[PDB]
Each structure stands twice: as structure tokens, then as C-alpha cells.
Design a protein around this motif. Structure first.
Motif, PDB file in Angstrom:
ATOM      1  N   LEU A  83       0.789  -1.134  -0.164  1.00 24.33           N
ATOM      2  CA  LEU A  83      -0.042   0.101   0.119  1.00 24.33           C
ATOM      3  C   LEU A  83       0.952   1.264  -0.188  1.00 24.33           C
ATOM      4  O   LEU A  83       0.310   2.214  -0.457  1.00 24.33           O
ATOM      5  N   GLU A  84       1.895   1.069   0.574  1.00 30.05           N
ATOM      6  CA  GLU A  84       3.067   2.116   0.796  1.00 30.05           C
ATOM      7  C   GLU A  84       3.979   2.426  -1.029  1.00 30.05           C
ATOM      8  O   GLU A  84       3.321   3.103  -1.142  1.00 30.05           O
ATOM      9  N   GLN A  85       3.978   1.710  -1.622  1.00 34.95           N
ATOM     10  CA  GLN A  85       4.387   1.344  -3.159  1.00 34.95           C
ATOM     11  C   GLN A  85       3.453   2.044  -3.616  1.00 34.95           C
ATOM     12  O   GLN A  85       4.262   2.616  -4.894  1.00 34.95           O
ATOM     13  N   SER A  86       2.189   1.569  -3.493  1.00 31.82           N
ATOM     14  CA  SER A  86       1.159   1.556  -5.008  1.00 31.82           C
ATOM     15  C   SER A  86       0.598   3.588  -4.230  1.00 31.82           C
ATOM     16  O   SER A  86      -0.671   3.881  -5.331  1.00 31.82           O
ATOM     17  N   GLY A  87       1.079   4.154  -3.130  1.00 32.55           N
ATOM     18  CA  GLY A  87       0.371   5.338  -3.006  1.00 32.55           C
ATOM     19  C   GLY A  87      -0.372   5.383  -2.284  1.00 32.55           C
ATOM     20  O   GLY A  87      -0.917   6.478  -2.199  1.00 32.55           O
ATOM     21  N   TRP A  88      -0.983   4.670  -1.708  1.00 30.83           N
ATOM     22  CA  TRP A  88      -2.145   4.855  -0.548  1.00 30.83           C
ATOM     23  C   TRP A  88      -1.421   5.337   1.169  1.00 30.83           C
ATOM     24  O   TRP A  88      -2.336   6.511   0.782  1.00 30.83           O
ATOM     25  N   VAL A  89      -0.328   4.449   1.675  1.00 35.96           N
ATOM     26  CA  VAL A  89       0.251   4.982   3.281  1.00 35.96           C
ATOM     27  C   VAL A  89       1.000   5.470   2.994  1.00 35.96           C
ATOM     28  O   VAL A  89       2.192   5.466   1.786  1.00 35.96           O
ATOM     29  N   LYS A  90       1.572   5.833   3.737  1.00 33.96           N
ATOM     30  CA  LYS A  90       2.761   6.399   4.551  1.00 33.96           C
ATOM     31  C   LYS A  90       3.565   4.957   5.857  1.00 33.96           C
ATOM     32  O   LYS A  90       1.959   5.231   6.692  1.00 33.96           O
ATOM     33  N   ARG A  91       4.317   4.740   5.541  1.00 35.04           N
ATOM     34  CA  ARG A  91       4.786   3.891   7.394  1.00 35.04           C
ATOM     35  C   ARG A  91       5.965   4.708   7.252  1.00 35.04           C
ATOM     36  O   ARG A  91       6.572   5.020   6.607  1.00 35.04           O
ATOM     37  N   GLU A  92       6.049   5.244   8.606  1.00 37.03           N
ATOM     38  CA  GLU A  92       6.505   5.303   9.929  1.00 37.03           C
ATOM     39  C   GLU A  92       7.671   4.216  10.963  1.00 37.03           C
ATOM     40  O   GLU A  92       6.928   4.337  11.864  1.00 37.03           O
ATOM     41  N   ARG A  93       8.790   4.027  10.304  1.00 38.35           N
ATOM     42  CA  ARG A  93       8.961   3.100  12.189  1.00 38.35           C
ATOM     43  C   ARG A  93       9.345   3.910  13.116  1.00 38.35           C
ATOM     44  O   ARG A  93      10.264   4.343  12.645  1.00 38.35           O
ATOM     45  N   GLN A  94       8.593   3.967  14.446  1.00 39.70           N
ATOM     46  CA  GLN A  94       9.363   4.737  15.468  1.00 39.70           C
ATOM     47  C   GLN A  94      11.000   4.032  15.686  1.00 39.70           C
ATOM     48  O   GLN A  94      11.036   3.033  15.537  1.00 39.70           O
ATOM     49  N   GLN A  95      11.748   5.188  16.295  1.00 38.29           N
ATOM     50  CA  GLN A  95      13.534   5.204  15.909  1.00 38.29           C
ATOM     51  C   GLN A  95      14.002   4.983  17.748  1.00 38.29           C
ATOM     52  O   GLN A  95      15.243   4.955  18.007  1.00 38.29           O
TER      53      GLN A  95
END
Ligand SMILES: [Cl-]
Ligand SMILES: [Cu+2]
Ligand SMILES: [Cu+2]
Lengths: 136, 146
Positions: free
Chosen positions: B79-91
Motif C-alpha cells: 500500500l505504501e509502494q502503490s501510493g495509498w499510505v505512508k510507513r513510519e517506523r519509530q526509531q
């Protein structure tokens, strides 16, 4: 118009998603309840129409189930190999292939019906026409 | 009531037969529409919960859909690659994976909503069809879980 149009779309989504869920639940239900008989859902549909009209030519079964002969031929042999039906072709006139329930195939109708009847606790044709148009 | 029960048995096999057959046509309509958006049924489930609550952590989506994080991991990447969502992994700290709809993912809600809405062409006949499928949802679930 805008408020009524938004609400009609909401009711469409609500109904169609419910039926969408039911399509998955039905597949699991029939797989679980038909396991005891060793038949698939499409095989059960063949037995379903034979229990209403027997015997039947394969062309008659295909007209009832809206299935091709290429679809029926493999599973018609599977129902014969499992002892449900018998296969014999005419030697004249329409040259058709007759499917006849065995004695064991006829007796088991009530047990199959009982295993399936629980699907409900103790119009469709119009949607079938409209939906088919949308898909094709 | 012997004969009476065998007739209810027959009607049951017939009403469920036709309800299943029409539900498969609704399913084929969904699959056609979802394919036009380039998404699958499982991706559609993720979008549906995001359209209710956004943003969500990966674990929150799993609770909503009752799916594991391993199952959801490739879905969210797609879904991120196809432009629907963003992914944010907290560091740091909880190190959650925060899923947020893109602007396009937010705008696509009404486009998907409208596309599905053509699945239907009477208020009375609606309530009866809705009522049958609502009770099948409840009954079939109870029978499957036995
Ligand atoms: Cl209005
Ligand atoms: Cu208006
Ligand atoms: Cu009786």
C-alpha cells in the motif's frame, strides 16, 4: 439531491458488503458440512437438480446449473466414481448422455438436506440480472 | 410434523442456494472494482479501517482486522509502494510502525465508495434483502465456529 445521493451510496455499500461477507461464509459453511459426503458444492448442485428431476441429460443439468459440458464432464465422472450417479449415452435421436441417480444417490437426499438446512435459523433474480451486467 | 419438516428442509436448501449464488455475484463485482483500483480484498480491509481511524499503528490495524503483524507487513509495504499510505517506523521508545494515509489515499475513499455504490440499481425490497444477508452473516458465523 446531494444528501439523498450520499445516503443511497451508503446503503448500497452496506448491503453489498454484507453480501460480500456472506459469499465467504457460505463457501466455508458448504465446505464444512459437505465434507462428510465427499462432494464439492458444484457436485452438490448436480445432485440438487437430479433430486428434483431424475434422470437428466447432461445438457439438461447444464441448463439448470448454467454450467458448460467441459465443466460437468470431469465432476460427473467423479460422482459416478463415488457411487452417486450412472452414465449412459443414447444411441439415437438427440444422441444425448443420460445421468441417472444410483439407489444410494437417491436415499442420501434427506441426510444432505439436513446437513445443509441449518444455514437459516428456524427479488434475488432481479439482482442476478443487474449484477451480471455490471460484471460483464 | 414429519412432512412439514421435510418441506422446510427443502426451502432452506433453496433459499440458501439462491442467496449464495447472488452473494457470489456481489463478490465478483467487488473483485472487479477492487482490481480497477489495483488493490486486493485484504488491502481493502486495511483501507477501510484507516478510513475510520487514521493514523493507526500496525498493531492497531491488526486488532481491528484480527490479522497478525507478519500478515500485515507485506500488505502495508504494498500500500505504501502503490501510493495509498505512508510507513513510519519509530526509531526509539515503543518503535511502533505508524501507518498514515497519503493525500491520495484519503481522496480515494470517496472514489472507492462511489465505485462500489453501483452494486445496486425499492426501500422495502432493500430492507428484506438487507435483513436476509444480515441474518446469514450471524447464522453462518455461529455454525462455522462449531
Ligand atoms: Cl439534499
Ligand atoms: Cu442536494
Ligand atoms: Cu407429520
Amino acid at each position: 439531491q446531494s444528501n439523498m445521493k450520499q445516503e443511497q451510496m451508503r446503503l448500497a455499500n452496506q448491503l453489498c458488503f454484507s453480501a460480500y461477507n456472506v459469499s465467504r461464509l457460505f463457501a466455508q459453511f458448504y465446505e464444512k458440512k459437505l465434507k462428510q459426503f465427499g462432494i464439492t458444492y458444484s457436485q452438490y448442485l448436480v445432485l440438487l437438480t437430479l433430486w428434483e428431476e431424475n434422470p437428466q441429460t447432461l445438457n439438461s443439468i447444464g441448463r439448470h446449473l448454467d454450467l458448460s459440458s467441459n465443466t460437468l464432464t470431469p465432476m460427473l465422472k467423479r460422482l459416478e466414481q463415488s457411487g452417486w450417479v450412472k452414465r449412459e449415452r443414447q444411441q439415437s435421436d438427440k444422441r444425448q448422455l443420460i445421468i441417472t441417480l444410483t439407489d444410494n444417490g437417491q436415499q442420501q437426499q434427506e441426510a444432505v438436506f439436513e446437513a445443509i438446512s441449518s444455514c437459516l435459523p428456524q427479488v434475488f433474480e432481479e439482482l442476478e440480472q443487474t449484477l451480471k451486467h455490471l460484471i460483464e
